[PDB]
């Protein structure tokens, strides 16, 4: 029943007079130069405006109908959490954020959270299970390399990944049929057994796919072995005047 809503929105936006001169006058690729129209120059002092923003009493834009479902207009001694000034969006204080975090409703979603971030929990799981040793205090240093830095098991090269996510999530406008599909097409079947029914949005899904398939190869000063497991252990393992390595397993 989404196509009726899309027809109502498309007829609603072709109802406007001077908006009809916008679409069907450009091209598809102009979407990119339609996405960026930041008339501010550079936001050249972000932390300055962030401290000036947090210096006020109501700096935040927050939703009304979710916060009036559970929240409270003022806390127990003069702490303001609400305004009536202005779309229906209400200004608020970070005291309402911490009041939400300590006296608000709660929904169990730990499976979704521990499944979106599998690469990062894999990093912490590999970090907890390592053992170190003594230092060395020796001269060390070597040239700059292009090294894959993530312990993935697939190792694609940023060209099968975009085409892979075209031919898994939404195949109606994916690509011309190339030669890179066939064998990995079997994996596509397995992916269509995974991302079929989830509450995860397609931008979050296309985010979390590219972190189990993409070994991030960068141009870094390396020394010793070039195993891909010890590349966060590159900045952890040694610098210019010192070195620490006693990893057994």
């Amino acid at each position: 029943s989404l196509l009726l809503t899309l027809a109502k929105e498309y007829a609603n936006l072709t109802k406007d007079k001077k908006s009809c001169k916008l679409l069907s006058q450009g091209t598809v690729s102009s979407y990119t130069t339609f996405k960026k129209w930041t008339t501010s120059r550079k936001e050249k002092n972000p932390s300055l405006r962030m401290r000036w923003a947090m210096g006020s009493k109501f700096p935040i834009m927050a939703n009304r109908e979710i916060l009036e479902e559970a929240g409270i207009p003022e806390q127990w001694e003069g702490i303001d959490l609400w305004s009536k000034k202005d779309l229906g969006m209400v200004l608020a204080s970070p005291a309402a954020i911490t009041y939400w975090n300590f006296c608000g409703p709660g929904v169990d979603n730990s499976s979704v959270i521990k499944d979106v971030y599998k690469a990062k929990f894999m990093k912490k799981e590999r970090w907890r299970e390592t053992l170190w040793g003594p230092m060395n205090f020796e001269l060390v240093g070597k040239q700059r390399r292009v090294v894959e830095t993530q312990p993935v098991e697939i190792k694609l090269n940023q060209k099968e990944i975009k085409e892979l996510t075209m031919w898994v999530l939404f195949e109606d406008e994916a690509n011309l049929a190339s030669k890179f599909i066939q064998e990995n097409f079997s994996l596509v079947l397995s992916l269509r057994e995974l991302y079929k029914g989830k509450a995860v949005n397609k931008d979050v899904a296309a985010f979390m796919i590219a972190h189990q398939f993409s070994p991030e190869k960068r141009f870094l000063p390396t020394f010793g072995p070039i195993r891909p497991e010890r590349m966060e252990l590159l900045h952890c393992l040694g610098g210019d005047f010192w070195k620490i390595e006693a990893v057994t397993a």
Partner: protein, 705 residues
């Protein structure tokens, strides 16, 4: 007792006590007021460095044209810098260059370059720094200036169907052939402009004052080009980028430390029984007033002699656009009475009529520039200002370093934008004077002026190159900027992990020893806590956010699972600068706390780390009160249209949406496509399909009318 902080250098090196001599803990000096005098000094100083008076009249422009190559009036002051290039000498240096490595060298690099130009989309022009919009004559980011250009194209004659680089360049040249060009002024009126005025406006470069340059006493004017110059400069920078990546005597792309060890070792393995080596640290002076684009035109005509017929004419347009640039002269000056009470403002237009209200220096600099001034601009035709060709001048330097005269005394080195390192090999000291004066001779003929004030030499490796002072064995690191550790300023969630990312990348690339790492981590933690007003629970701070935390701390069981944004302590360290704080702490949180924080039904986030403190601060207040109000409304329209595109193609922010038909037809054809696919295996209802078909046909008849 006196005190002296330099005495540490009596028993140390300049690789340890050299970070002490940078005043990088204080503010950079900013500029104030008009930037007219600095632009006048740049243009008039270039014409003073022309070393000629050979002027040639013009048929296109209404102003005289001074020539800058092969036309020399040799002054006796030759230690003064010249800006006059001999083209037979430099083509002899390029022919001397390609006889060193390979035979079809330039053919190979040019075929790779054109091979990368033909597979390039023009939206790459939006991934850049600020440019100059000639529609409203201001400085804007790249995407706004590009869409205002395409807006002027589609409003003037026809529509646009290009979607490549080459067809966009051809579209600009076709816009040069048009007799009249029309655009939108401000409340959106539609104006027109002529043909010679469009040429005068397509070649306008906007000059301003360079703000925040650590290391100079006087200010300097930086210049920004338009939009009709950026694709051609992109082409030339791809060509020279491939040439510089292929060479072995350059330091722009980057390793810059392996090359110097290989050339110091490889040229210290090439000595006879009596020879020796002298290295000389140099600095090329007036680098932006002595690089003419006419020698660039001849050299780029020499590289692509056997490449194609497209590339031979496509790599020969940006030099022709640099031989005829205009310059915006800032915004004028200000006059005042004797009592300093009323101060009138004179802009750059009426500066000629108000000529007799200036100083001595302003009238000197203005009367050396008067027959080259237009109404607003000036006609410079031999300068190469800042923010332009940077990888081709390095090819000029490598051409000066590969000179072969035929003893057995010679030189090598390494070249950057304007900083060279010269290694000389000879036998006695007057022969060293002969070789070094030969180097200043070849650089002096080609158009490169070594500065005699900032240059010196030694026998072994004690040189200096791109602010890394190399001593005999050790190397010091670059003194990095301090405010870069805290420049996120968006969120309570995307600040501390971004600061750990900046500390990490400054630990890998530069030195950044572990003590400086822990200290910088702790100071960024403290500026975070001072910014967002959150202190730990055991602290004595009693404000409007710690009253709630101090009141409700008895509910939380495991107290060291709290976030730093909620009054938690620190668990990240040097060995955890890739693990965020939230993901490190989710093994220790209370289930009530964790289920309450990460709830996606939150009134703040709804409408790389975990998104649960992600809020948006409110907008400004004077953005809807000026004369530029409705332009803000204009961006709203674009957002709405983009949202409609996101409503149709469910995966559009992943892959780049190329195509050249329209945006509305792909929407309607897509809704009919998924209406048929979801029709025959799905929907099946006459009122829904006929009502959707009725809305698509009614919206199509509304769009066509």
């Amino acid at each position: 007792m006196e005190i002296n902080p330099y005495l540490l250098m009596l028993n140390n090196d300049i690789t340890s006590m050299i970070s002490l001599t940078y005043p990088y803990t204080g503010a950079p000096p900013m500029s104030h007021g008009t930037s007219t005098k600095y632009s006048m000094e740049t243009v008039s100083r270039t014409y003073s460095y022309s070393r000629t008076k050979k002027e040639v009249p013009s048929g296109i422009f209404p102003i005289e044209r001074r020539k800058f190559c092969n036309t020399i009036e040799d002054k006796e002051n030759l230690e003064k810098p010249n800006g006059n290039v001999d083209i037979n000498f430099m083509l002899s240096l390029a022919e001397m260059l390609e006889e060193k490595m390979g035979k079809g060298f330039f053919k190979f690099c040019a075929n790779e370059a054109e091979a990368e130009i033909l597979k390039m989309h023009f939206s790459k022009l939006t991934e850049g720094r600020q440019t100059y919009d000639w529609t409203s004559e201001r400085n804007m980011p790249a995407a706004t200036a590009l869409q205002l250009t395409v807006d002027a194209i589609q409003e003037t004659q026809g529509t646009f169907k290009g979607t490549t680089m080459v067809e966009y360049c051809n579209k600009i040249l076709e816009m040069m052939d048009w007799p009249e060009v029309k655009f939108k002024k401000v409340t959106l009126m539609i104006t027109k402009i002529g043909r010679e005025e469009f040429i005068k406006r397509i070649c306008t470069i906007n000059t301003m004052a360079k703000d925040g340059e650590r290391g100079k006493y006087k200010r300097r004017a930086i210049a920004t080009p338009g939009m009709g110059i950026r694709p051609f400069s992109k082409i030339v920078e791809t060509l020279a980028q491939k040439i510089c990546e292929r060479l072995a005597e350059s330091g722009l792309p980057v390793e810059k430390k392996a090359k110097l060890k290989t050339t110091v070792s490889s040229t210290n393995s090439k000595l006879q029984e009596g020879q020796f080596m002298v290295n000389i640290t140099g600095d090329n002076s007036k680098w932006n007033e002595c690089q003419q684009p006419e020698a660039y035109l001849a050299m780029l005509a020499y590289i692509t002699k056997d490449s194609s017929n497209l590339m031979k004419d496509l790599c020969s347009v940006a030099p022709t656009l640099f031989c005829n640039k205009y310059v915006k002269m800032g915004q004028g000056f200000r006059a005042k009475n004797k009592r300093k009470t009323k101060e009138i403002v004179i802009p750059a237009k009426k500066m000629k009529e108000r000529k007799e209200l200036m100083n001595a220096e302003w009238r000197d600099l203005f009367e050396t520039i008067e027959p080259y001034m237009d109404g607003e601009c000036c006609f410079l035709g031999g300068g190469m200002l800042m923010g332009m060709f940077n990888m081709l001048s390095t090819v000029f330097g490598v051409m000066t370093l590969n000179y072969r005269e035929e003893r057995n005394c010679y030189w090598t080195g390494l070249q950057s934008s304007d900083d060279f390192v010269l290694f000389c090999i000879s036998r006695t000291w007057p022969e060293m004077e002969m070789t070094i004066l030969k180097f200043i001779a070849v650089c002096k003929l080609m158009g490169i002026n070594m500065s005699l004030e900032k240059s010196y030499g030694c026998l072994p490796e004690l040189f200096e190159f791109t602010s890394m002072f190399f001593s005999g064995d050790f190397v010091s690191n670059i003194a990095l900027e301090l405010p870069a550790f805290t420049t996120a300023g968006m969120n309570e969630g995307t600040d501390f992990t971004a600061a750990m990312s900046v500390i990490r990348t400054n630990m890998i690339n530069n030195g950044l020893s572990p003590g400086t790492a822990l200290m910088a981590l702790r100071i960024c933690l403290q500026e975070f806590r001072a910014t967002y007003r959150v202190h730990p629970y055991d602290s004595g701070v009693k404000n409007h956010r710690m009253k709630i935390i101090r009141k409700f701390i008895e509910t939380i069981e495991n107290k060291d699972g709290l976030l730093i944004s909620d009054g938690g302590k620190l668990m990240n360290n040097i060995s955890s600068l890739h693990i965020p704080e939230e993901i490190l702490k989710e093994d220790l949180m209370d289930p009530s706390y964790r289920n309450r924080v990460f709830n996606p039904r939150n009134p703040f986030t709804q409408f790389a780390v975990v998104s649960t403190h992600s809020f948006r601060t409110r907008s400004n207040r004077t953005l809807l009160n000026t004369d530029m109000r409705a332009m803000a409304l204009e961006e709203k329209r674009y957002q709405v249209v983009c949202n409609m595109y996101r409503s149709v193609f469910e995966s559009a922010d992943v892959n780049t949406p190329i195509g050249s038909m329209s945006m509305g037809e792909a929407i309607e054809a897509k809704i009919l496509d998924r209406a048929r696919t979801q029709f025959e295996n799905g929907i099946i209802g006459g009122e829904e399909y006929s009502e959707i078909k009725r809305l698509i046909e009614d919206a199509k008849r509304q769009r066509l009318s």
